[PDB]
Ligand SMILES: CC1=C(/C=C/C(C)=C/C=C/C(C)=C/C=C/C=C(C)/C=C/C=C(C)/C=C/C2=C[C@H](C)[C@H](O)CC2(C)C)C(C)(C)C[C@@H](O)C1
């Protein structure tokens with residue numbers, strides 16, 4: 001059964017995915033822009 | 036060519052016909068959309084304890100008359116039915132918007148299936164269209180009759196909802212046991228509605244089946260035209276609005292005093308209006324007063340618009356009016 | 365093979381090689397169904413092997429027995445498992461189904477013709493020719509599969525109503541419950557309009573078996589009608605054709621209504637993910653369909669598992685295949 005700590009870890013995976021996605025998206029998008 | 040403020044006159048062109056159709060669909064959606072939206076706000080502002088004819092509830096009393104949350108009278112026990120009806124109407128609105136947009140920019144610019152395609156001067160086309168719409172209208176009337184048979188609507192004399200003889204040929208003569216604007220019998224309402232549904236369906240069958248006849252093509256001097264057809268429709272609408280306003284003002288069986296408030300007194304200053312005959316607080320009017328007066332004056336201006344469109348349909352041009360007043364300075 | 369992304373012929377992507385090979389694709393689906401049906405029967409037999417009578421199901425960690433006990437299989441009054449043999453029968457019958465599916469998959473992968481476009485010209489098998497472009501062909505497939513799903517749902521409802529019924533949570537035992545057929549009441553749940561007021565979890569706030577059984581009757585009838593619709597017509601309509609779609613195929617909305625193999629796969633995958641999320645809500649809240657006499661009370665873990673799967677299918681798979689299909693609409 002899910003406990004509060006495990007749910008916190010799941011939210012951590014969400015936030016970490018978001019951070020990495022925004023960083024990588026910014027980098028790749030800007031690299032593609034001024035090709 | 037037309038200016039932007041008169042932009043809808045552009046739809047008069049048979050060059051762009053289907054888009055014209057789209058507009059009408061949109062209108063109905065808007066209409067049914069409001070039926071949802073209004074109710075929701077009403078359901079928000081409707082206190083159960085207070086009499087239902089004090090706050091701005093117009094649709095809620097109409098539902099209350101059709102059963103829908105009334106018991107021994109003056110009884111409100113579930114506001115969920117009103118929300119259900121409003122949601123049904125508002126959801127139908129989305130479908131009608133979809134159809135409107137399909138014809139507006141996705142469908143053909145001009146209908147010229149072609150069976151739906153018509154022209155402003157094709158009396159057989161309009162005859163069959165008229166028949167079909169009449170059939171649907173009579174079907175709705177018979178549906179109301181079935182609702183009376185099975186569910187049954189609120190009655191004040193019985194004090195409760197109840198379910199259910201054609202002396203209609205005497206009501207039409209307004210014999211002193213009549214003047215339908217004073218009906219007080221559920222059986223009378225049901226029988227008359229059965230009769231009107233039957234007659235509407237018969238007329239629809241007839242109009243689909245038979246083309247317009249020369250004898251009645253004599254009198255219709257100019258209505259075979261866009262402006263003429265619109266004018267006749269508007270005049271019919273105004274007539275209906277006057278009748279509905281009078282019914283709402285006078286009749287109490289259909290419009291119970293519980294949800295609508297007491298009857299109205301017809302008063303006349305420069306123009307007619309309807310007074311409450313109720314000791315409501317100053318600045319407040321029963322829902323019956325609002326319904327009767329707004330309906331009546333909308334019908335009056337519908338009559339004026341009917342005159343305008345009819346005059347334009349015949350040989351008359353209003354832009355000549357200042358020029359005349361120019362010559363006779 | 366009907367794709368040229370960069371890596372079409374890579375062994376780790378080799379399933380794409382069956383994009384057009386109808387016979388092999390049919391065999392592959394049949395073998396996969398064999399897997400999907402082996403698991404339940406095998407794990408039910410394994411569960412019944414270690415089942416103990418005194419302890420209750422939630423404390424034994426069984427993940428297939430609760431769903432069977434919810435249907436009155438081997439349970440009596442008070443919601444206690446009495447006899448374990450019918451679970452074993454269910455497991456064995458799933459073994460049979462899996463064996464038949466695997467036999468079919470083996471036939472169509474090796475013995476059967478690889479591409480049904482090479483069938484011998486109306487040999488009982490050209491009737492099964494389909495193409496990922498023509499709509500008419502795939503319409504009858506959707507119709508017949510809807511027939512099967514509808515018959516299953518109707519069978520479930522009919523069993524519940526007439527024969528041996530289900531374990532009704534409120535009545536505390538297995539009963540043939542009298543269905544509720546108020547269509548407005550049932551379809552209200554879809555917007556949360558439960559009788560006790562609007563509820564956050566749609567379709568999941570049912571508090572009586574009658575609602576669910578009536579809903580199943582409604583769904584069965586609807587799916588049967590849709591099956592008739594698709595089998596009997598097979599023709600594109602202005603709903604599919606001429607609908608707005610936003611895609612870089614043409615930057616901005618277009619009314620093309622494109623069709624493609626990856627697109628069909630993507631819509632199916634998104635549908636599955638959505639069902640996963642809906643089931644997540646269901647097992648989280650709806651305890652009429654999941655009596656805590658069997659599944660336990662705390663059920664956050666299973667709901668979270670469903671949530672993760674639904675997100676993976678709806679977002680990941682759906683997006684990936686939709687984007688690939690839209691890009692392939694540059695042919
Ligand atoms: C002849 C003519 C024309 C005019 C033509 C027109 C406009 C003629 C007018 C026609 C009208 C106004 C006809 C109206 C008919 C009304 C009917 C048929 C009413 C039916 C109502 C019923 C059946 C009510 C039924 C119940 C319903 C209700 C519930 C009651 O509780 C009970 C009960 C039974 C009374 C033109 C325009 C062609 C040319 C002119 O110059 C001359």
Ligand SMILES: CC1=C(/C=C/C(C)=C/C=C/C(C)=C/C=C/C=C(C)/C=C/C=C(C)/C=C/C2=C[C@H](C)[C@H](O)CC2(C)C)C(C)(C)C[C@@H](O)C1
Pocket residue numbers: 040041308309310311320324325327328329332333336
């Ligand atoms: C559209 C168009 C135009 C024409 C536009 C026109 C002429 C539009 C006409 C608009 C009108 C006159 C609309 C009339 C609306 C009527 C209303 C709003 C009725 C109101 C009644 C109320 C509010 C109730 C009043 C009570 C309230 C209370 C119960 C009292 O106890 C008694 C009683 C019943 C009087 C132009 C001229 C602008 C340009 C053209 O080319 C196109």
Ligand SMILES: CC1=C(/C=C/C(C)=C/C=C/C(C)=C/C=C/C=C(C)/C=C/C=C(C)/C=C/C2=C[C@H](C)[C@H](O)CC2(C)C)C(C)(C)C[C@@H](O)C1
Pocket residue numbers: 550551553554567570575576577578579580582583607608609
């Ligand atoms: C076609 C289109 C698109 C797609 C649009 C989408 C996403 C459309 C979505 C379509 C959906 C989600 C259709 C699904 C409808 C679901 C239905 C009809 C469910 C019915 C279920 C019922 C009636 C069951 C009810 C019960 C039955 C059940 C057994 C339980 O006892 C609970 C109880 C009693 C509520 C785009 C995105 C491509 C472009 C759009 O503009 C248009």
